[PDB]
Amino acid sequence: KRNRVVIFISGGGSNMEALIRAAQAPGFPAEIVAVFSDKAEAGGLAKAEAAGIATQVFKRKDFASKEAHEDAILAALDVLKPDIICLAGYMRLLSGRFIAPYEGRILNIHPSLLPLFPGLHTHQRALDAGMKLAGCTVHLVTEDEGPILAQAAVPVLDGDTAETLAARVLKAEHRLYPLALQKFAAGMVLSA
């Protein structure tokens, strides 16, 4: 029996779609049972629907408080019985209270080499620090910053912008998230 995964998104769902694609393979140890979003306009939803994955939207504005919003989400999760929850560009902070029932089972991808640049603008920040490598991190989300599960590095090239660098790191995220999920559920880069 494969691990049941629910992916959360708020935007275009690039990493969500990478997870859905990797999970189609024979013997992959997880299946994607739903994609949840806090935004109806999130481009990832249409992508999930086209690949035949159930989708659910819970808008914050539709509840009287953040707790009522997390409560609706938890009740909805419970009917799906996920084993693993993957955040893939979800833009809301999870309370400790939300995390508790899924302690140790919530993963997140972040486009820096944590603990560097744990907040926003990670690619510009790498360029501003003059770094020659950058990358991404999958970690557990904890009751900021649970245990790192996996990391990937790519070169920063002469002449990169935040946009060119982000696009390269994103190829790496597409490969890293499935690998971390595979490891969870079941040489060197030189830049000069």
User: Which residues are annotated binding-site positions?
Assistant: 13-15, 66, 91-94, 108
d(CA 25, CA 43): 24
Place of tokens 């902070």: 93
In the bound complex, what is the minimum distance in angstroms from residue 98's beta carbon to Cl ion? 28
CB 81 within 8 A of CB 4: yes
In single-letter form, the type of residue at position 116 comes to: L
Judged by beta carbon distances under 5 to 8 A according to partner kind, the member of a second copy, Cl ion, none in contact with residue 121 is Cl ion
d(CA 43, CA 26): 27
Residue 33: name the closest of 1, 73, 2, 6 by CA.
Answer: 6
Q: How far apart are the first and last CA of the chain?
A: 46
Tokens of 66: 């953040």
Helix (H) or strand (E) holding 4: strand 3-9
CB 82 within 8 A of CB 4: yes
In the bound complex, what is the minimum distance in angstroms from residue 47's beta carbon to a second copy? 24
121 binds Cl ion (CB under 5 A): yes
Residue from 69, 110, 123, 139 carrying the catalytic annotation? 110
188 binds a second copy (CB under 8 A): yes
In the bound complex, what is the minimum distance in angstroms from residue 103's beta carbon to a second copy? 17
Of 92 and 132, which has the nearer Cβ to a second copy?
A: 132
Active site residue 123: no
Q: Which of 16, 19, 149, 165 binds a second copy (CB under 8 A)?
A: 149
162 binds a second copy (CB under 8 A): no
In single-letter form, the type of residue at position 145 comes to: E
| Binding-site residues from annotation for (6R)-10-formyltetrahydrofolate | 66, 91-94, 108
In the bound complex, what is the minimum distance in angstroms from residue 156's beta carbon to Cl ion? 12
Span near Cl ion by CB under 5 A; candidates 35-43, 49-57, 113-121, 144-152: 113-121
183 binds Cl ion (CB under 5 A): no
Task: List, by residue number, the catalytic residues.
Answer: 110
